Design an enzyme around this catalytic site. Sequence first.
Site, PDB file in Angstrom:
ATOM      1  N   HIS A  87       2.182   8.911   0.761  1.00  0.00           N
ATOM      2  CA  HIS A  87       1.000   8.904  -0.079  1.00  0.00           C
ATOM      3  C   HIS A  87       1.293   9.783  -1.284  1.00  0.00           C
ATOM      4  O   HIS A  87       1.735  10.923  -1.111  1.00  0.00           O
ATOM      5  CB  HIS A  87      -0.192   9.465   0.715  1.00  0.00           C
ATOM      6  CG  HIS A  87      -0.447   8.688   1.968  1.00  0.00           C
ATOM      7  ND1 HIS A  87      -1.290   7.584   1.985  1.00  0.00           N
ATOM      8  CD2 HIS A  87       0.071   8.793   3.221  1.00  0.00           C
ATOM      9  CE1 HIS A  87      -1.316   7.064   3.209  1.00  0.00           C
ATOM     10  NE2 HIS A  87      -0.465   7.790   3.986  1.00  0.00           N
ATOM     11  N   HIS A 130       4.018  10.755   6.193  1.00  0.00           N
ATOM     12  CA  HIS A 130       3.489  10.657   7.545  1.00  0.00           C
ATOM     13  C   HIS A 130       4.554  10.067   8.445  1.00  0.00           C
ATOM     14  O   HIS A 130       4.996   8.945   8.199  1.00  0.00           O
ATOM     15  CB  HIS A 130       2.243   9.770   7.537  1.00  0.00           C
ATOM     16  CG  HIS A 130       1.072  10.470   6.930  1.00  0.00           C
ATOM     17  ND1 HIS A 130      -0.009   9.798   6.401  1.00  0.00           N
ATOM     18  CD2 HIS A 130       0.819  11.779   6.740  1.00  0.00           C
ATOM     19  CE1 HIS A 130      -0.881  10.669   5.944  1.00  0.00           C
ATOM     20  NE2 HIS A 130      -0.405  11.878   6.132  1.00  0.00           N
ATOM     21  N   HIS A 167       5.803   6.754   6.270  1.00  0.00           N
ATOM     22  CA  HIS A 167       5.392   6.239   4.974  1.00  0.00           C
ATOM     23  C   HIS A 167       4.786   7.387   4.160  1.00  0.00           C
ATOM     24  O   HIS A 167       4.789   8.539   4.599  1.00  0.00           O
ATOM     25  CB  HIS A 167       4.414   5.082   5.190  1.00  0.00           C
ATOM     26  CG  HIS A 167       3.192   5.632   5.839  1.00  0.00           C
ATOM     27  ND1 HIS A 167       3.014   5.606   7.211  1.00  0.00           N
ATOM     28  CD2 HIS A 167       2.150   6.295   5.305  1.00  0.00           C
ATOM     29  CE1 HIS A 167       1.883   6.213   7.500  1.00  0.00           C
ATOM     30  NE2 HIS A 167       1.344   6.640   6.349  1.00  0.00           N
ATOM     31  N   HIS A 192       0.819  -1.210   0.000  1.00  0.00           N
ATOM     32  CA  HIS A 192       0.000   0.000   0.000  1.00  0.00           C
ATOM     33  C   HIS A 192       0.858   1.268   0.000  1.00  0.00           C
ATOM     34  O   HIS A 192       0.403   2.305  -0.454  1.00  0.00           O
ATOM     35  CB  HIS A 192      -1.020  -0.029   1.149  1.00  0.00           C
ATOM     36  CG  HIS A 192      -1.958  -1.174   0.991  1.00  0.00           C
ATOM     37  ND1 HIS A 192      -2.189  -2.090   2.011  1.00  0.00           N
ATOM     38  CD2 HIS A 192      -2.659  -1.600  -0.087  1.00  0.00           C
ATOM     39  CE1 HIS A 192      -3.029  -3.012   1.582  1.00  0.00           C
ATOM     40  NE2 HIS A 192      -3.331  -2.733   0.291  1.00  0.00           N
ATOM     41  N   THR A 227      -5.624   7.048   8.552  1.00  0.00           N
ATOM     42  CA  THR A 227      -6.278   7.227   7.263  1.00  0.00           C
ATOM     43  C   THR A 227      -6.354   5.903   6.492  1.00  0.00           C
ATOM     44  O   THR A 227      -6.691   5.904   5.309  1.00  0.00           O
ATOM     45  CB  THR A 227      -5.545   8.255   6.388  1.00  0.00           C
ATOM     46  OG1 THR A 227      -4.264   7.683   6.108  1.00  0.00           O
ATOM     47  CG2 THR A 227      -5.393   9.594   7.086  1.00  0.00           C
ATOM     48  N   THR A 228      -5.999   4.792   7.135  1.00  0.00           N
ATOM     49  CA  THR A 228      -6.304   3.487   6.557  1.00  0.00           C
ATOM     50  C   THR A 228      -7.069   2.676   7.596  1.00  0.00           C
ATOM     51  O   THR A 228      -7.036   2.989   8.788  1.00  0.00           O
ATOM     52  CB  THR A 228      -5.017   2.730   6.183  1.00  0.00           C
ATOM     53  OG1 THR A 228      -4.255   2.445   7.358  1.00  0.00           O
ATOM     54  CG2 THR A 228      -4.157   3.518   5.223  1.00  0.00           C
TER      55      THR A 228
END
Lengths: 277, 277
Positions: free
Chosen positions: B96, B119, B94, B65, B208-209
């Site tokens: 996005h 993040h 990680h 992801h 947010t996941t």
Amino acid sequence: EWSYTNILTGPETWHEHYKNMCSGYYQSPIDLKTDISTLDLKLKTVIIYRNTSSTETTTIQNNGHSAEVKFPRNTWFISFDGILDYKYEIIQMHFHWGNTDDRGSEHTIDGFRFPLEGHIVSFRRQMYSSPSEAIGRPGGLAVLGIMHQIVESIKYEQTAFKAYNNFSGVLNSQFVPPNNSTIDDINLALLLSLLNPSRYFRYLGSLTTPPCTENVLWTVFIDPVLITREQINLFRNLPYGSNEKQTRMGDNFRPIQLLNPIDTLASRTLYRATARG
Amino acid sequence: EWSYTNILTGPETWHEHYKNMCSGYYQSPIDLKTDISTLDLKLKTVIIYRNTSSTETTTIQNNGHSAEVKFPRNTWFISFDGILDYKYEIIQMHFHWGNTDDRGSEHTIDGFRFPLEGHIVSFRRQMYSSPSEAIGRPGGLAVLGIMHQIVESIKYEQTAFKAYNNFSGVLNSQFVPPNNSTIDDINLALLLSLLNPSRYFRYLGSLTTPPCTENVLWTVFIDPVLITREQINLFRNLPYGSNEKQTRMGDNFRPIQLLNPIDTLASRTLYRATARG
Ligand SMILES: NS(=O)(=O)c1ccc(CCN/C([SeH])=N\c2ccc(I)cc2)cc1
Ligand SMILES: NS(=O)(=O)c1ccc(CCN/C([SeH])=N\c2ccc(I)cc2)cc1
Ligand SMILES: [Zn+2]
Ligand SMILES: [Zn+2]
């Protein structure tokens, strides 16, 4: 462990013995300040409602710190949105009171203490499947605070003790910890009807005993329900647990916390509700 | 069981697939609105700092992801209060990003999407002794959001990739899930120096996941750090996990959530911070 009256284990020590989370900045209780609160017209009348097909027994226990009514699962519910779809399920109700009539409540309203504050504790069944799943998880709990005030002239039937059915007589000197008894069910809908269920303070806070978890949606009704001196003295007959310095149960309240301690990383707001005017 | 790009398991399904807590009303990300935010002068400059006795290795993983840098325990810390006493411990960082340069970030600032949001995930070591204790518990996490913007003209040494040490050149088409590689440590202090660490949005929100746990203290810096077109492309060569429809990793961001959905029982406020001025 912890206590109210033993200076070694009492509320001033909780921030140290239970850092998680009694040292946090979203603690309860707080002073509910009418002038420094935000009116939010979107906050609706609270409804308490029963599953009429439930038949299991209610019990009460002297746990050494309070008298705690334990309700059967799937029986009593709170709605904050007018829909009766079991979003919040009531678990238990317990009480905080004073050695004298001019103190006892955990919350204050504009600095004023009531003799007795009852806490109806529920979990967000909308999200969590059981009390034990919810109790330590984010957003798991919602508590209703009910203030009681003493009147000299009143019929039994108009006091909160009618809704409580006098706790079936269990509040006496022989109700020693950790005894529990079956009692008649508490008519929580009648209790709520003794005050204005549209008129309340609302804020995000914590349990008021260790471990002070910050996962409680608080609702504190502004209008008190009514009791007599005779009724408040019944609670005073219970003995404290052996962890306590004081013999008879009383002053079982946590001191006032600030809405926003100076070390907060995101301020919270105190809200107020009133009826569609 | 979840994805970004596969409509069976994608973001629009999370409210249903993960009710606790993706159905909640304190979700992230949100639109960070400069006008509709409250300035709070008490919120201090963020500091990131290292334990210099630490020697354990840093790794990065394609987890299917995102690209996730995993830091060793007891090594990197955040301070929000000026004291270097290990209150927040950094776990991982990680990213996005978008298929194209005009999208990618999870948060927006006044409706604007950045091409890459990093993040930096920490736990509140002040209260919780490990990541796994904190991850599921109230108030357990704090995340820093770092926006990145693309520029045409810059020396490598002034790009965020210098702080990342180019991820040790590990990002390529062959870095498939769930492979991890040892990498040179990330200089998180340099990274923070590339933007203004006093100027940020602050609010209480969620992962947010899935499961979108509502226990994140969010801080999103307003000024972006800078990268090149070549550098963003390094991320886009990574392959997505098999649960995704798209082959190349990208558009791994969640849709914008409302600050206060209509069902909230206690509104949250978006705060902002700026330097003592
Ligand atoms: N006070 S409160 O509403 O915030 C509150 C509500 C629930 C809990 C969870 C543990 N306690 C249980 Se399951 N029962 C008791 C509750 C209070 C007391 I004093 C004695 C027993 C703690 C505190
Ligand atoms: N995006 S976030 O900052 O709110 C965020 C931060 C932490 C977690 C906890 C579970 N996942 C862990 Se520990 N690591 C990953 C995080 C994001 C991604 I995409 C892939 C892996 C979820 C989400
Ligand atoms: Zn209580
Ligand atoms: Zn993230």
